Amino acid sequence: TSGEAPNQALLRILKETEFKKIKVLGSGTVYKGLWIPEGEKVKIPVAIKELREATSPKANKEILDEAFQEAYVMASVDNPHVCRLLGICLTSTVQLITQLMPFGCLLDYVREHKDNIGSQYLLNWCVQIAKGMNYLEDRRLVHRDLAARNVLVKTPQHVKITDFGLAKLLGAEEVPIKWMALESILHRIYTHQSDVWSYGVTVWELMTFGSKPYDGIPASEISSILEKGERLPQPPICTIDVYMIMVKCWMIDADSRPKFRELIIEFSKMARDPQRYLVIQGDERMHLRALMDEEDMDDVVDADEYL
Numbered sequence: 001t002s003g004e005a006p007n008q009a010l011l012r013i014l015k016e017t018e019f020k021k022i023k024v025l026g027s028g029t030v031y032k033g034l035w036i037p038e039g040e041k042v043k044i045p046v047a048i049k050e051l052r053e054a055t056s057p058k059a060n061k062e063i064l065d066e067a068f069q070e071a072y073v074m075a076s077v078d079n080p081h082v083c084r085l086l087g088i089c090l091t092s093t094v095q096l097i098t099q100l101m102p103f104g105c106l107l108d109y110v111r112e113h114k115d116n117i118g119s120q121y122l123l124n125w126c127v128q129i130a131k132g133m134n135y136l137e138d139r140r141l142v143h144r145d146l147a148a149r150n151v152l153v154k155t156p157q158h159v160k161i162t163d164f165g166l167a168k169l170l171g172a173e174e175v176p177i178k179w180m181a182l183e184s185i186l187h188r189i190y191t192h193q194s195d196v197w198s199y200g201v202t203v204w205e206l207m208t209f210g211s212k213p214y215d216g217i218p219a220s221e222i223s224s225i226l227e228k229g230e231r232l233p234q235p236p237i238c239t240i241d242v243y244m245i246m247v248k249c250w251m252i253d254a255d256s257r258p259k260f261r262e263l264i265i266e267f268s269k270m271a272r273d274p275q276r277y278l279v280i281q282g283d284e285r286m287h288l289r290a291l292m293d294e295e296d297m298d299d300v301v302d303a304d305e306y307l
């Protein structure tokens with residue numbers, strides 16, 4: 001009651017007996033599996049991150065600080081376009097349990113499905129990511145690591161921002177350079193407007209079907225490139241309407257860049273007439289079960305319907 005509000009998010013501790021790992025997804029080693037809350041007659045698809053046991057105690061506390069910090073953030077947020085933490089489990093190694101995003105990160109998704117992503121998907125993704133960031137801004141959260149790789153894909157129609165390792169309250173105090181606002185690189189300044197810049201880069205990643213920003217350019221130069229007024233080039237499928245919104249996100253005066261709530265409005269306008277704003281050959285002809293090896297999927301509930 002001296003300024004900020006108490007964070008009353010619930011931190012759920014889960015038992016190992018309650019979830020079954022099914023398959024490895026990555027290596028912090030991440031499994032796909034199912035979580036069956038005791039006595040609830042539901043099966044919830046989950047990602048289970050089992051932390052690396054770590055050799056050096058300095059590496060140990062680095063792993064653990066990322067883990068507890070992003071457990072704290074994901075437990076405190078609740079929005080259809082941000083990833084929710086379902087719980088943690090304090091076995092010998094700590095495990096973080098999140099809602100399963102079956103289709104992986106969005107960068108790999110647009111890379112692998114270039115020839116079947118239509119303009120309606122692209123623009124709807126832009127709207128959903130801006131809704132997620134607008135929610136974070138409503139909660140005074142600055143993400144500092146927004147990128148296509150940090151957007152996950154529940155369905156082709158539904159994505160969610162993730163990876164809150166670098167997040168912080170707006171006013172508070174204490175490295176992907178090609179996604180960083182200029183004032184982030186020069187003065188270590190981070191705001192919701194620097195997130196807006198990163199959002200511009202992410203949209204450019206999407207519109208280019210996963211190209212690398214400033215490909216082959218060494219990070220040491222990016223700062224001088226940007227002070228000289230250079231920016232990422234207009235993607236081939238982008239009308240000037242879309243590209244111009246993106247370019248506005250990269251203006252040097254952070255207060256001149258658009259706001260996330262403006263970006264929601266503008267991309268929603270454009271998603272009302274997708275083919276007037278992105279030009280994709282064969283657009284009109286583009287389309288997109290037991291994910292586990294379990295034969296009894298009848299009681300499966302998505303985390304979003306259990307909550």
Ligand SMILES: Nc1ncnc2c1ncn2[C@@H]1O[C@H](COP(=O)(O)OP(=O)(O)NP(=O)(O)O)[C@@H](O)[C@H]1O
Pocket residue numbers: 025026028030047049098099100101102104105149150152162163
């Ligand atoms: N809930 C989830 N559902 C499905 N896949 C996931 C989920 N969470 C993470 N992954 C993937 O599993 C791997 C673990 O990623 P992560 O633990 O976030 O490490 P990271 O280095 O921070 N990756 P990033 O957030 O993209 O910067 C990545 O390939 C993710 O895309």
Ligand SMILES: [Mg+2]
Pocket residue numbers: 066070163164165166
């Ligand atoms: Mg992280």
